[PDB]
Amino acid sequence: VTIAHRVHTILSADLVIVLKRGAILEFDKPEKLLSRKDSVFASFVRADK
Amino acid sequence: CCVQIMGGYFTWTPDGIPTLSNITIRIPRGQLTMIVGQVGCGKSSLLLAALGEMQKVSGAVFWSRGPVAYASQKPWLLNATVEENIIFESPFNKQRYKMVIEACSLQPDIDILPHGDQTQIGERGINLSGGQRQRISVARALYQHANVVFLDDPFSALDIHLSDHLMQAGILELLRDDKRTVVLVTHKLQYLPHADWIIAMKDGTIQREGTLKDFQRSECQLFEHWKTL
Ligand SMILES: Nc1ncnc2c1ncn2[C@@H]1O[C@H](COP(=O)(O)OP(=O)(O)OP(=O)(O)O)[C@@H](O)[C@H]1O
Numbered sequence A: 001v002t003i004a005h006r007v008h009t010i011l012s013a014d015l016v017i018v019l020k021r022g023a024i025l026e027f028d029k030p031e032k033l034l035s036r037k038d039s040v041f042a043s044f045v046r047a048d049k
Numbered sequence B: 001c002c003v004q005i006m007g008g009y010f011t012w013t014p015d016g017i018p019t020l021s022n023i024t025i026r027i028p029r030g031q032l033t034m035i036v037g038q039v040g041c042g043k044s045s046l047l048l049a050a051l052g053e054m055q056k057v058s059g060a061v062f063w064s065r066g067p068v069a070y071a072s073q074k075p076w077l078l079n080a081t082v083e084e085n086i087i088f089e090s091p092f093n094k095q096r097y098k099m100v101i102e103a104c105s106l107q108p109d110i111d112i113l114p115h116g117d118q119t120q121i122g123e124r125g126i127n128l129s130g131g132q133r134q135r136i137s138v139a140r141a142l143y144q145h146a147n148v149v150f151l152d153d154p155f156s157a158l159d160i161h162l163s164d165h166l167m168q169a170g171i172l173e174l175l176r177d178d179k180r181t182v183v184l185v186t187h188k189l190q191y192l193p194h195a196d197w198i199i200a201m202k203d204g205t206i207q208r209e210g211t212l213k214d215f216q217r218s219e220c221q222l223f224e225h226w227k228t229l
């Protein structure tokens, strides 16, 4: 169970869980999360890459 | 023209192995230069040697000494008032103070402190999280108002939001000074085409030095840099 300061390293995970200020936001596989573009994870991986 | 060390040999113990050997370093006047390398490769050691913390087995350090602002790798605060240790015995300036803090993004973290700005923290006061310690350590050097500011892995306990904010605001403010050299080492090569000079090293020994027209000499090292897109 990983905590990531590098969203690019967590990319190889089986399931990614996103956290807002106190709750999960749509735990899912990384592919769908990055493809949705509505995920905050998309903003992360796009501002970091 | 500024700080330079030709063929330096530095060590920790005068009987052990000469940890750093055959180094040639340059830091231009009023620029932004970074140092990178592997883990434990010796990226803080060169710096502490160029700060006078290592008996040089050989070589020659040349300056201009000066009250160089600094932030150790592990952030370290004082057993005193938050204002008192971010100021650090400087003539208090409301404008510069608030500007530095906004640059370090500490206002929402100050608001949660019981006495706000004048909260008495330290090893005797109330304790807090490593992110705030790191930000205070950076603010101490930013408010320091020294010619050669100097950082050591500030982007360690910081996420992407706060790292972006600090980098952008603080470092662009530093560059906004007519002449204010700042030297920060980091692991994220993300901000390479923002640094005016680059120093890469491995196993202590330096490899290359040059920002763009020198990063075109080989594809192995530059591909290693761009491995993370
Ligand atoms: N305070 C110390 N006392 C003794 N040896 C040290 C000390 N600090 C570092 N060393 C040794 O010197 C070598 C270089 O250490 P240095 O602190 O430069 O690592 P670094 O590359 O800056 O760290 P990081 O990779 O975490 O940024 C290391 O192999 C370490 O074993």
Ligand SMILES: [Mg+2]
Binding pocket: B040, B043, B044, B045, B073
């Ligand atoms: Mg180090």
